[model samples]
Target: MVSKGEELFTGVVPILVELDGDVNGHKFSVSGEGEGDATYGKLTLKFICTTGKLPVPWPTLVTTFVQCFARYPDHMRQHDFFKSAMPEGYVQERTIFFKDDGNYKTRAEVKFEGDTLVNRIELKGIDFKEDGNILGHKLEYNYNSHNVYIMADKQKNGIKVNFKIRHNIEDGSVQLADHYAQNTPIGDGPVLLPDNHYLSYQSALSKDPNEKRDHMVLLEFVTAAGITELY
Candidate 1:
């Protein structure tokens, strides 16, 4: 079915979409809406390339970015010191148990720098634990991505946008499922599967009656798509 990493990825979809951006040339914007625990809000972001070399409007771009910045503080923190308020080492981890198959787990770590306004993120590890013990060790993966809002003048600007994209592989050794290993490519590399392709495959795999095995894959697929849609 699906893997634990995938499930964890889905649970964080709200945060991911809240930070996604769409750009055209030097001008760009990102927007999203989220509802949680009876609270809901709209998020919008914009960016204008003001090197004086492009025809994009600066005010429009700034305003769009600011709107998105309000909902996604993580993105704003990358470039603006004032917006970077998330504490250091905010970590999220998830474990998936498959009844007949096995267990899969994922852990991610996020660190923010106040001086550079850059957020450093890393996937510490993903493991396959079977029968109450470690079965396979997934390699450690790491990368650096940045978020920043360009502002006028020396002082920080309120109309700021956050931008960031972190990459990692949906590896096979992690023991997601037999079908995943056989049907998908194997290796520690970038994963860019299209939503339709992923969904089609996941739907077929979820028919198994085993709750543990079925839920693992189902959760993983649901989560991955949710995360991708955010961007």
Candidate 2:
């Protein structure tokens, strides 16, 4: 059985916005999180720009800055900063344990499971770069019983994972599923936009140019696992 693709999110992530107009090309790095309410055909986003100067009517420029991901009808998932943010509808539980070896290395083991889907993911590795943010890391994925399993192996750089299993199936197309995982572009793997979405700029400056302006935050507007590697 395969599950219908649901509108997914990018939780909270640092998204880089490069505006194309100024002679020097101004860029803004801010905290952005997005969600989709396909029921209303909406994609909501929150951008926290604590610093930097923004031209009036900047809201309209968000689409041009990240045009690839600004449209809700284009893709089922959001590509902001983190590679994968689990889709909605499933209750999620995560358990993390640690072990210190005689060789003086910390072996961290993590177990992630979903309450509604028969899916699980185990991440084992050395010191993680961060408890969160697991993009550009190679990992293993298992699919069976219309469910998905992910195994994150040992590595010096910590790994993070999010999983969603397909349960909306029809016909026998489940056998046509595809799988891919990578840190680089190669083969016919999960085709995705070149590493453009992960661009990083200097941290937000402390000076707030729009302190006197109205504070507008997009509080609301609102995957898949044919194993398609997303960017």
Candidate 3:
């Protein structure tokens, strides 16, 4: 099922996790949201410190930056940023998950510039998977395929802080194959399928208007004049 209206925003805000000495009531947060109509957003990263002693030698955080991303037309071309609003070390770990999931996670080292640390990162045009191709040579897609999950964490090697973000992608773009019976010709013929094949509903309707109609049928075409097979 599709959602009715536009989504407000898609973003993430992680929880604080302390690795070493306690800084007491200190809080660190990272949040971001994408353009209402697109799959990209800007990230706002922050760190706040209160009473207690700051952890010596500082601690690093390795977190998931992006996940379950479908390669869009503007895929890797989207411009990104890391403005050390207050001197933070960030290393982009793009290769680890590229082959399997096409995700972007990062390793960050936060240091105090003043009393607080802030940073901004901008990303745009990251899309979601419209269809999934499996190793079994089958094409599949479900409602959940449109759901994208984002996560962030706080810690060096062990667990300190963590958070999750989520967003839904809408399939609003008009594809050449988006034709339905209402929008296209009503006459029965060889209807085109997403794959290079034809389909048509030729089941006979019930003579009695009040009878429950069964509308399931299948067809196997050995060959067609204008259709080309992948083999």
Candidate 4:
């Protein structure tokens, strides 16, 4: 979703990733929130190994980034990432489930930096049972078309990582034409589904309810919109 080198910085940390190499136990994490009315609260996100505080003005994050996202090509195909934290908006949690099982989960939160949107992601519940590491999967997301396709190693893939057009599952049911693959992609790769295709799709791709009925609805919109999906 994020470009390999399309970086952003919070105080000193840089938003970056490398597919070729990584150190163990070392991760890139970003999270934090606050009372919208707080005159003295803080928001921050951790990058690499450094902690960076979020910026201010409540509406700054939106100005720094966009509902729009940058693109990255898979060492295999392609990918997406969107900005978060909209004020007075109801875009809560943009989440999707993989196969409807609770084996894997991911969430997103938008924080602020000097002048950029710190897109934080939390990935957990990995079915790392000796074979299901999400690291082994490859994904592609087309922002222009909003089409997404994710594939993984057989016997390890998370039921082929499903997709959701909206945050709430109740928004719609998985129709027969919902995904790029049918039956399953837990089989090997080079999955070719010529008949079924979608205009907007997501691979693996938030949370929190801060208001009442409409508040909660907006929270769902904000939180749901911020969330990507669970692999």
**Top of the candidates by TM-score:** 4
Model 4 TM-score (2 dp): 0.26
Give a tens-digit lDDT track for model 3, residues 1-231: 111111111223222222221112232232422211113322222222222332211111112222111111222211111111112223222211212212222233322234232123221111212231111112211111112121222122111112221121234321111111111112222211111212111111112344233111111111111123335
Instruction: Please tell me which model should have the higher TM-score, number 1 or number 4.
Output: 4
* Total backbone clashes of candidate 3, pairs 3 or more residues apart or in separate chains: 2
* lDDT of model 2 at position 63: 19
lDDT of 2: 0.25
Candidate with better lDDT, 2 vs 3? 2
| Candidate 2 collision pairs | 2-167, 2-168, 2-169, 3-166, 3-167, 3-168, 37-222
Over 1-231, each residue of candidate 1 has an lDDT whose tens digit, in order, gives 333222222221232211122222222222222211101112211212222222221211111111111222222223222222132222323233332334323232322233111211111112223222222223212222223222322232122222322222235233222111111112333222221211100111112244222011111111111112355
Question: Each prediction's Cα lDDT score?
Answer: 0.22, 0.25, 0.20, 0.24
Clashes of 2: 7
TM-score versus the correct structure, for each prediction = 0.19, 0.25, 0.19, 0.26
The most accurate candidate by lDDT is 2
RMSD of each predicted structure = 22.3, 19.7, 26.7, 20.2
Give lDDT: candidate 4, residue 217: 8
